Structure formats: C-alpha cells, structure tokens
Design a protein around this ligand. Structure first.
Ligand SMILES: Nc1nc2c(ncn2[C@@H]2O[C@H](COP(=O)(O)OP(=O)(O)O)[C@@H](O)[C@H]2O)c(=O)[nH]1
Lengths: 430, 607, 186, 44, 36
C-alpha cells in the first residue's frame, strides 16, 4: 500500500542509502539476511512500503543502485547489509564522468539512462499503488549531479502526478573538495528547480559542526554523518509506516509546506542529540525536545535561520505523548518568536505524531522548514560561479562536449531570478 | 545461627562464556546475579563465591585447572574491581582496582604468570597487563575504537589478538621494553563487524565471527584473510560463540540460536540443528564429545557432537522474578511471575512444569484459586488475565481495569469476587461469573500504588497497603468506613494474624510494626540493617514464628511472642522480594529479583 | 468470494501491474512457464503463460474448488495478444434452473455443437493486441433457451499474454471506458 | 549496444565471491591463452 | 596413527559418562557453604 521506490546515483548517494537501508532494517527487525526477527506485530504490518517479498520468506529492498563507475558498488556489495541488495539493480558505467557535468548529462549519461529507466519503470509497475519517488545524491559530483537530474526529468515526464523528494548535498566553500563545484552545482540545480516537487538541502560542513558540538565526540566520520542523514531519512516516513493519532504522509507535507510552485527548497533537522557524557544527566521532556529542534546549531544546514523569517515549518514527533502539550509549545514558540515568522500566514506550524518511537529512544522529533534564509547558499554559489566564469576558466572542457556559453548564461540568470523571488517575500508585508 | 537451603534455581546467560566446565571436570562454574557458584557433579555439593558488589560481567579460567578470574561492572563514579580466586582453596587470592566502569574481557597465558584485562567503552578502551603473584600494571595501551574481545595465543604468549569493531588487530608485547606494537589486519573492501574469536592449536590460523553471520579465516603470520565463511548462506543474527575440535572442525553458535559445524574444506555444514534462545556459552568436555551449551534465556543444553541433536538438561528463570504463589492448601506446585512469562514448578523436583507466555508485559501478584479454577494475573497495560491450569489458554481478559497497570489482587474464599489495586490509588471489586465479569467498585481514592491486599477468614474485612504511607482497612460490604493507619514511609507487605486481631505490617523503614484497628502497637520490632528495606513476610498457621526478609541478602525468621531472632539465612544475591511458606509448612520459599529462587528447610522446632 | 459485494459497471479479476496479480488464481503447470514481461508493442508489463499441450496448462478462477465465485454480471471482456498459436478459454455459468453449463471458445476448432453440459465455439483473432467481449446472455438464451443467474468460473489455457480480464456489464465505447480500462494504442 | 553490455556482464558475475573469481577464461578454454601480449619467453 | 594414552582416554570416558547421568539435576545442593 502506497509504496515508494529508492534509487541511488553517484557514490555519495550510494553511501547514504547503503546504511539508510541498515537503519530501516534495524528498526523493522530485518536481519542482514532478509529474514524478519522482530518482536512486535506492528513491525510486520507495513513492510511492503520498502521491501518486496521473495520466495523463501526473504525480503529484498526496492532499491536501484546506479553509478558510472563500478568501484563504489563493488565496495557496497561487501558492505554491511549489502546482501539484501539484489544483484540485478546494479547499473554501472565503464568510464566515469570525470566530475564533468557534460559527460554526466549529454554524451555518456544519455546513452546509459536507457537501462536504468527500464529498471525503474518495471519497478514502478511492480508496486501496488505508488506514492512517489525519493532521491539521495550530491550536486558536487559530475555523474550524480548530471545523470541523476537527467533521470529526474525523464521520470517527471512519465509520472506527472507523483510526489518526489530530492535529498541533495550542496557544495560549501568551508569544506571544498573539488575545484569545479560551482559549474556542475548550478547546472544541476537549474534543471532540478523546474521539476523538483521537494528538495532537501544537506550541508556537510553543518554536519561536521553538529557532530562536533552537540555530541562532544572527538573523531566523527563519514559513517556518523551518514547516521545523521539516515535518521533524517527515517523521520520523514515513520508516520506513513506506523500508526498514530495524526497521520500525515508525503502528500500531506507537500500540501502543507509549499505555498507556491517554485518555493520547494527545505532545510531539515533531527532531535534529540546528546553526548555520551551527559545522556543520563539530561532529562528528555517535550519542552527539551522542542527547544533542541528549534535550536540554530541542531539544523543540518549552514544557513542561519535568524537572518530570515520562516515561511512555514513542520514537525514529526515519534513516541508516546499527548498532543495538547505539543500544541502548547508550538503556540508558545510561535508567540515569543513572532519576529522570525512571516506575519501574513498565521499558524504556519504543522504537527504530526507517531506512536512508535525509534529503537533505543522513547521520544524523537524531525523538523522540516521552508525559510527565507536559504538564499545564502544560492548567492554564495552564484558568486563563486561568476568568479570562475568571467575568466572562462575550466570552460573548454564543457564546451568540447556539446556545451555552449548560452546554457551557462541561462542557468545563471534563472538562479539569480530564483534568488530574487525567493527573497522578495521576506520583505513582503500585509 | 543459619538456616539450611536445599535447592537453588539461578543462572545468568546475559554474560558471554558464562558457563564454564572446569578442566579435569567434575566441576561446573557459572555466575549468579552477583555471585559465582561452583558445583561438584558426581556429588551434589556446591560452593558460593561472594566477593563482589555488583553484577558479574566476565568469568575466565586458566589451563590445567588453576585459579579463576571474575570481573563485574560498577557505576561511573567508582572503578570496577577484578577479583582473582585461588582454586582448590576457594579463597580470594587477589583484588585489583583499575578501569573506569566495566571490563570487557580477561585473558590468561599458557603459563599462569600473566594476565590481560580489557576495559569497557568508557575509559577509552584501555588494555592492561597484570602479574598474578603480585598485582602489578607493567604497561598498557589506549586505543580509539572499541575492541570486543582479546585472546592470548596458545603458545608464544608475546602475541595477542584483539577483535576491534572495525577489524582484527595483532599486538606484540616484549619484555625488554614496556612498549606494545600494533598491526592491523587489512581487509580488501570489507566492513564486517567482529565479536568473537578463536585460534587453532598450531597458532597459524584464527577464526573470527561476524555480526552478519559469516566466519572469517585469517592467518597470524600475515594480515591476509582467506575465507569469508559459509557460502550462499548466513546465520541471520551474527556469530555468538566459536569452538574448535581437534579435527579443525569449527562449531559455531548463531545469534538466533543455532548449532552447526563446518569442516576444514568448503564451508558447508555437515549437520545443523535448532536451539531455543540466543547461544551464549559453549564448553567442550574432555575428549571433545557431548559439550555444554548455555543460552541467553538461561537454558542449559547438552549438545552431542557430529550428530547435532539438542537435549535440554535443565532450564532456569529468565530474569527478575516478581512474585510467587501456592495453591490454597496445596504445596506440591508453586507459580512464579516473570518479566514476560508465568511459570509453574514442582517443589519436590524443580523441573519446569508449564509456562504461560505474554510477549511484552510484566505480571504482578499472580493469585491462585481454589477448586482448581483459573490462575489470575495483572499486566502493565492495566489488563487482567485468567488462564487454565493444565494448558495455557485464557478463560477471560478484563481490559482497561486500571490506567497504569494492576498491581495486586486478592480472592475471597467463596470466589465470586476479586479485589484489585492499581498504581494511582484505585481499589476495585469485580464480580466474576462463568457467564460474564462485571465490576461494582467504589472507585475509592488512595494516593500511592498498593502493594498488598489481604482478606480475613470471614472474608468481609480486607486491608490494603499503599506506597504513600497508609494501610486502609475496608469493610468490603458498604465500601466505606475509612479509618487508615498512619506512619511516614513507603509501606510493604501487611498480614492479618491467623485468627487474631493484630496486623503485622512492614514499610521502607527498618521496622516490623504490630498494629491494630485501634492504633494499638504491641512492639516496634526494629529489624534493621544499614540500608535494608524489609519487604517480605509470612506467618505460620499457628502464631509461633514469622518469616521476614529485607532488601539485603540476609533473610531471618523471628519468634512471634518474643522479639528474638532464631536462625538466619544467607547465600542470596541482590534484593529478596517475596517469602512464602507452603501450606504443609515443611519449607520456606524465597524469590530474588536477580533471577534466583531459594527454597529453605524451615527449622524443626517451630512445629 | 465476490459474493455480497458491490458491482455496478465493472469488475476486474486479473491485471498484471500489481504486487501479487494472481492470488485468487490457482496455477497448474506441467510443461509450460508463467511470468510477466514488459511488452514491445505496448510499453507495459504483461503476464504471459506459455507451453505445449495447451490442455494441461491453465490457471483457474478459484484458488481451490468446492466453492463459487458468485458473479451476477452479464458481460465478460478480455484483453489478449494474438500470438498465432493455439488458445482456449471457457466459462462455467448457472442458469435459471440450478444447473451448471459451460461455454468453451477455441482457436483450433471448426465445428460448433450444442450439448446439455458443454457448448463449444470456434473463435477468430485479428493480428496484434485485441480486446474481446463475451456476451454470455444471448449465448445461454440461444443455446438452452434459459436465462442466467450467476457465472461460476472462468478458465484460461496456455499460449497467451494477458493484460486485463474484467466484467463490463454492457457494450461500452473507448471514450466512456476509464483510462485504466481502455488500451492505450502504441 | 551489442558490446559494452558483454564487458559489463563479467563484472557483476565477478562480484559474487563464493571463494572464486571469474576472469571469463577458467576451464576448458581452447588449447591455452597467450602468456603475454606476445607469445611466451623460453624460460618461465 | 599416534598411540593415545590407554588410561587417560578411558578416564575421560567414564568421567564424562558419569557426568552425563549425574548432570540431570543442578538444583539440589545438600552442602550449602554460604560463607565458603
Ligand atoms: N555525506 C557524504 N558525503 C560524501 C560522501 N562521499 C562523498 N561525499 C561528498 O561528495 C563530494 C564529492 O562528490 P563526488 O564523489 O564527486 O560525487 P560523484 O561524482 O557522483 O561520485 C565531496 O565534497 C564529499 O563531501 C559520503 O559517503 N557521505
């Protein structure tokens, strides 16, 4: 019932999903061998959402793994919970994109897209009734940022009515891992804005800041960052998979969070996060949860929200508690922070509750907010883009594979516009 | 003086490799909640080792049957203590104080002179070496990532193995310099998580288990691995324990509970079998046949080799007995509440009789019914359930009786009604009838959770004791006349005196207090340890003596008429909570919150 | 099964786009094979049964015998791809009298005969995909001059690729067929 | 397209370990495959 | 093949055999030794 398929493109997305599936299997009581060994009956009532049933009682995730090089799939196949992935869905190239969006989107991606399109189409007809699709990828890598959004355009062409998530890792200048980030970043986001029903921005420098500050652990790793991202992943669809007093699905979020068709860029967060030094000192209560999930340092994004006003926000609580107290901190935090909320949309806070908490924690919360502070990433990325582009540096490699300067010009103009109308409503008054 | 104990029902399968068959045999050692026990096998004798404060975490023994090492987990503020017991003397030969919270593993060399201890995840995974003759910390090693276990080599004790969470590490220790050298065994594109390890007698190869369920094979002379393990098939919850036959055959324990053997060939099972509970301990007997298995659910199994058929030797309680009961004027059988599943046991022979299982609920105050009717229990959700005696099917369920779980129950003799108590001071009366179950409670208010309700012989009068500090006596006919007895502490068991007017009551204070409905106190017994909370009491049909038990390990019975203790009870571990006396009164039974069950021979001269 | 249940205009028994398209269906295979593939002519997944000795390879309307699929509906309809091979399908029906009759349709039969229990009919299939409408009403009224109450069973034999089998209840047109019911042309 | 699919086929068949590797030429493969890009040296 | 110890192997033998029969019950003690 109302399932979603899960597909990865690019090594970043593959690594995210690799242990996203681990988290999902753990919370559903699924072993690395596909055999259910949970204890509660509710663990089995809604497993078709992510797992297909195979002969012998085993379950296989409905995930399609895709990349233009075989190394990352070769590694993830031997990774933990790698046996669940069915060998057929592995679609790999033979050359690699060279972090070049042209090789990732026109020459190699266009010819390679046919097999993955066939597989995703068959998988789509496989499920009973489809909710939509959700993506995990990075805009900073050539193969991902190009051919993933290519696939996005194709799939949105064929299924106009479904809802789509895109959890995207944006580049930042603090931790910069590649010299050509602005080019492929703007090229990917220009196409993504026109078709993305919802975009979830994730910042790795923000991840480092969180894992440094909130938990006080000395040496975090890509695994820990993936853990935070996976918790954010599971928090969204906990409510669709488990019962609750106020059930709200992906279409619920789409209705309640998007005022206008071009305003679909979101920043997310997860709570609670505690050190191993203070977990049993700290007493977890609803006010503590809410003050953490509205904290500026708990957000997965580097953009500071107090430089803008929230257009809207939504929160999903997990665990056993009544709803009226939740409502009262919502109203109190809306009252004392009325300066940071837009004044012509009262009651811009969505609340949802699920009665099954995550394993090991009796209460949890996931926050997703559409705010007027997102313009910072776009302006700084555009500034980097024009800094690279006014001297035509790194340009001949793109223009030698079907690119011209006109596409870059249109992408830059479109992004500047998107910034303009995204910040226009910040100054709007009733 | 001291009171005899005839039987003990206790075992803790939570700690890995807990069950150990002492080399030269005839001796079997296992940890109780906080004390170690050793048992002679040909004879029926046993001995207690009590030199600990908290729950034991690790048990290890040397080769050739020399001294034993035991380690426990403590609070963050203090430090865990490692206790070395000399065997054949049953004496604490050494005590060592280091590490922050808990110790993960202990290792003995082939020679008995050296020791290795491993701290918990807290203290930042500190590895320490010790000298047995004099407690000395020659040197140590801190490492960032967690290491689940460490083992010494069979020969060449200078080389040791550590199954770190990321992978395998080989450590070299030299006498010339206190330094320790670390080499990390490299795996090509492998991120398996590793818990258990074993070493072949030739010390060439080591077999290490995985959380996925495939056993890896690594030579020590190099960082190269050879084999992943059983191909095309896994064990579905990781690898619990490893054992090596003289053939090189590898006996493996799976997390789900599974015993299988792999030849030194293609990793294919020659024989496979299924065993209840998660596997926790495997001990090979001398000549390596018919070994012992210990589950995570406190079950002891006798598993044959090369033809894997599981045979259940004996079963023990899982954890945390909550209460005990006898049938009315019957002592052959007694029932125990558990964390999840009620059990019934025979007094003469303590083999299990029948279990009634509930998935995720705690029971409280299981109450028997005369005329052989159903057994009644209350659960966390607030529901009350009745089950038939021979077979565990329910007669009926009462739903939403109390908001936060029924705590105590009491039955009238003529059995048409039940009285029940909730946590939030609600005492209710229900009229049972074969057709239907109804309630006519007063919904009387009573602040704290009620721990005990008693009904007199004529069955009209019924007293209930709260946590708040009030023991209220109810007429049960008009549900009124609220005169309630006052003292300021957390109450516990209350009892009528059989065919008298006095109430023998207890509370959190270290005093057993004789009361009456007229605030008449015969004596204030004041049976106090340093921080004891006397909790369980029982009375003989003739008021000669009463049995009393605190939170402390000691349990004692006192003469009713005069305030002098006769005899005493020891050998318990943890907090003793319930003390009953059989209707025949030939024994006294006690249930310990750490999984132990004790039956005591009541002294002869109290008849 | 399908008794005391609503039906007004349509009722779909089998469709090849779903997690478990055939649950009520029971399959018996001796030398054949069953699986669903995306079709080249229609870009969609289509269930397929194939094999030799078309009689022995079939799928039955109930998972098990000894009970009925009670259906009041008059008009059957099927979407079949013409593969230029043998094909048979039959339907078992209840009349006014408590009698069970059956109509078989065969690709390889050339003569039609009426009999108290069986009424065989030849059929002709045009090239490519096609949907066929089975009246069954005039059919029973002509074969035995007795009206119909309920249609017990439906049976499909080997060598065919199937997309939808449903009850349409009356002659309809493509425009009034909802999008799922209509076959979108390649 | 024809080829490029074949070469991709070997890789996923190789990813299954099963204590074995499939280089595509293991057993009953012609007389013998040339020991280098050129034919072998006299002393191996 | 190596020659095993005739006395040692038979000693392990009847030791394990007797342990089999006498291992049926572990509850009864009849020798308390609470202190030691
Ligand atoms: N969170 C996370 N980020 C990653 C991971 N691997 C790479 N990245 C980020 O992705 C950027 C490079 O992406 P790239 O490898 O070129 O993507 P690709 O071209 O699709 O393979 C780097 O700046 C990294 O910060 C990962 O496992 N987790």
């Amino acid at each position: 019932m109302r399932e979603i398929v899960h597909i990865q493109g690019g090594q970043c997305g593959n690594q995210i999903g690799a242990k996203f599936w681990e988290v999902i299997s753990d919370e559903h009581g699924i072993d690395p061998t596909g055999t259910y060994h949970g204890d509660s009956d509710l663990q089995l009532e809604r497993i078709n959402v992510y797992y297909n049933e195979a002969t012998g009682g085993r379950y296989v995730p409905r995930a399609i793994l895709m990349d233009l090089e075989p190394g990352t799939m070769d590694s993830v196949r031997a990774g933990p919970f790698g046996q669940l992935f069915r060998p057929d869905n592995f679609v790999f190239g033979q050359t690699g994109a060279g972090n070049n969006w042209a090789k990732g989107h026109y020459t190699e991606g266009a010819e390679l897209i046919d097999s993955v399109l066939d597989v995703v189409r068959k998988e789509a007809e496989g499920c009973d009734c489809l909710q939509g699709f959700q993506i995990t990828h990075s805009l900073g890598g050539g193969t991902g940022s190009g051919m993933g959004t290519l696939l996005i355009s194709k799939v949105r062409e064929e299924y106009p009515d479904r809802i789509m998530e895109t959890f995207s890792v944006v580049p930042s200048p603090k931790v910069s891992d590649t010299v050509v980030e602005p080019y492929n970043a703007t090229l990917s986001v220009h196409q993504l804005v026109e078709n993305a029903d919802e975009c979830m921005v994730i910042d790795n420098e923000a991840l480092y800041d969180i894992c440094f500050r909130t938990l006080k652990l000395t040496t975090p790793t890509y695994g820990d960052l993936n853990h935070l991202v996976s918790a954010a992943m599971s928090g969204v669809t906990c409510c669709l998979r488990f019962p609750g007093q106020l059930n709200s699905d992906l279409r619920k979020l789409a209705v309640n969070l998007i005022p206008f068709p071009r305003l679909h860029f979101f920043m997310i967060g997860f709570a609670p996060l505690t050190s191993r030094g203070s977990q049993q000192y700290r007493a977890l209560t609803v006010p503590e949860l809410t003050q953490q999930m509205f904290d500026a340092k708990n957000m997965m994004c580097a953009a500071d929200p107090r430089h803008g006003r929230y257009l809207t926000a939504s929160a999903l609580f997990r665990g056993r508690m009544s709803t009226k107290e939740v409502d009262e901190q919502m109203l109190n935090v809306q009252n004392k922070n009325s300066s940071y909320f837009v004044e012509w949309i009262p009651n811009n806070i969505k609340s949802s509750i699920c009665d099954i908490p995550p394993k090991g924690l009796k209460m949890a919360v996931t926050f997703v907010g559409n705010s007027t502070a997102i313009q910072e990433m776009f302006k700084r990325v555009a500034e980097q883009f024009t800094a690279m582009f006014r001297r035509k540096a790194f340009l001949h490699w793109y223009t030698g594979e079907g690119m011209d300067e006109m596409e870059f010009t249109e992408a830059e103009s479109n992004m500047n516009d998107l910034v303009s109308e995204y910040q226009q409503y910040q100054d709007a008054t009733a | 003086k001291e009171l005899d104990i005839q039987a003990v029902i206790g075992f803790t399968g939570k700690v890995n490799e807990g069950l150990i068959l002492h080399p030269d045999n005839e001796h079997l050692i296992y940890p109780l909640g906080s004390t170690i026990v050793v048992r002679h096998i040909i004879s029926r004798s046993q001995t207690f080792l009590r030199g600990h404060d908290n729950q034991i975490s690790i048990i290890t023994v040397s080769k050739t049957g020399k001294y034993i090492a035991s380690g426990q987990k403590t609070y963050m503020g203090f430090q865990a203590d490692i206790i070395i017991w000399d065997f054949e003397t049953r004496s604490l030969m050494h005590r060592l104080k280091l590490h922050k919270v808990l110790i993960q593993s202990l290792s003995f060399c082939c020679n008995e002179q050296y020791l290795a201890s491993l701290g918990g995840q807290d203290d930042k995974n500190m590895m320490i070496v010790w000298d047995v003759e004099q407690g000395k910390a020659l040197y140590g090693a801190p490492n960032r990532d967690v290491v689940n276990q460490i083992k010494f080599f069979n020969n060449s004790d200078d080389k040791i193995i550590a199954v770190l969470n990321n992978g395998v590490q080989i450590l070299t220790i030299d006498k010339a310099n206190k330094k320790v050298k670390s080499l990390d065994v490299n795996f090509g594109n492998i991120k398996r998580q590793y818990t258990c390890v074993a070493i072949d007698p030739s010390d060439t190869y080591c077999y290490c288990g995985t959380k996925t369920g495939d056993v890896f094979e690594i030579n020590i002379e190099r960082a190269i691995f050879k084999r992943l393990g059983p191909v095309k098939k896994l064990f579905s919850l990781g690898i619990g324990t490893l054992g090596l036959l003289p053939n090189g055959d590898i006996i493996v324990g799976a997390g789900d509970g599974t015993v299988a053997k792999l030849s030194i060939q293609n990793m294919q099972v020659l024989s496979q079998s299924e065993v209840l509970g998660a596997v926790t301990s495997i001990s090979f007997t001398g000549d390596y046949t018919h070994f012992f298995c210990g589950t995570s659910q406190s079950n002891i199994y006798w598993i044959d080799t090369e033809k894997l058929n599981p045979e259940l030797r004996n079963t023990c309680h899982y954890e945390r007995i909550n209460d005990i009961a006898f049938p009315y004027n019957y002592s052959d059988v007694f029932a125990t509440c558990s964390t999840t599943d009620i059990r019934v046991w025979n007094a003469r022979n303590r083999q299990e009789l029948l279990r009634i299982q509930v998935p995720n609920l705690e029971c409280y105050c299981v109450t028997f019914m005369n005329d052989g009717k159903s057994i009644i229990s209350g659960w966390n959700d607030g529901k009350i359930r009745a089950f038939l005696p021979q077979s565990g099917k329910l007669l009926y369920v009462i739903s939403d009786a109390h908001i936060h779980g029924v705590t105590a129950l009491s039955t009238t003799s003529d059995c048409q009604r039940i009285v029940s108590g909730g946590s939030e001071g609600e005492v209710r009366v229900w009229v049972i009838n074969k057709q239907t179950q109804v309630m006519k409670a007063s919904m009387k208010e009573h602040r704290g959770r009620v721990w005990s309700i008693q009904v007199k012989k004529n069955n009209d009068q019924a007293v209930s004791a709260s946590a708040d500090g009030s023991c209220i006596i109810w007429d049960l006919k008009t549900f009124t006349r609220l005169m309630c007895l006052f003292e300021s502490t957390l109450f516990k068991q209350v009892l009528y005196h059989p065919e008298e007017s006095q109430l023998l009551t207890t509370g959190s204070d270290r005093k057993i207090t004789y009361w009456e409905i007229y605030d008449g106190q015969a004596i204030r017994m004041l049976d106090g340890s340093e921080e004891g909370e006397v909790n369980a009491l029982s009375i003989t049909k003739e008021g000669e003596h009463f049995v009393s038990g605190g939170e402390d390990k000691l349990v004692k019975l006192w003469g009713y008429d005069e305030g002098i203790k006769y005899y005493s009870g020891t050998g318990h571990s943890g907090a003793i909570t319930r003390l009953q006396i059989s209707p025949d009164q030939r024994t006294v039974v006690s249930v310990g919150a750490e999984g132990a069950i004790f039956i005591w021979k009541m002294p002869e001269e109290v008849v | 099964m399908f008794k005391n249940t609503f039906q007004s205009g349509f009722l779909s028994i089998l469709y090849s786009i779903g997690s478990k398209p055939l649950q009520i269906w029971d399959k018996s295979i001796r030398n054949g094979h069953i699986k669903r593939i995306t079709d080249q002519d229609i870009l969609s997944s289509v269930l397929e049964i194939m094999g030799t000795n078309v009689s022995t390879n079939y799928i039955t309307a109930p998972a098990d015998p000894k009970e009925t699929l009670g259906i009041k509906l008059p008009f059957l309809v099927m979407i079949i791809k013409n593969l230029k091979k043998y094909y048979t399908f039959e339907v078992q029906v209840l009349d006014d009298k408590n009698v069970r009759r059956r109509f078989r349709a065969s690709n390889y039969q050339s003569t039609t005969r009426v009999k108290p229990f069986i009424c065989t009919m030849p059929m002709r299939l045009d090239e490519g995909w096609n949907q066929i409408q089975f009246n069954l009403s005039d059919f029973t009224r002509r074969a035995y001059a007795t009206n119909y109450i309920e249609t017990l069973r439906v049976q499909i034999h080997a060598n065919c690729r199937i997309r939808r089998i449903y009850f349409s209840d009356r002659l309809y047109s493509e425009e009034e067929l909802p999008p799922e019911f209509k076959l979108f042309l390649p | 397209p024809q080829q490029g699919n074949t070469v991709g086929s070997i890789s996923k068949r190789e990813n299954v370990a099963s204590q074995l590797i499939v280089e595509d030429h293991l057993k009953n493969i012609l007389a013998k495959s040339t020991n280098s890009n050129y034919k072998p040296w006299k002393i191996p | 093949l190596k020659r095993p110890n005739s006395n040692q192997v038979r000693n392990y033998y009847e030791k394990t055999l007797a342990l089999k029969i006498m291992s049926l019950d572990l509850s009864t003690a009849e020798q308390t030794n609470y202190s030691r």
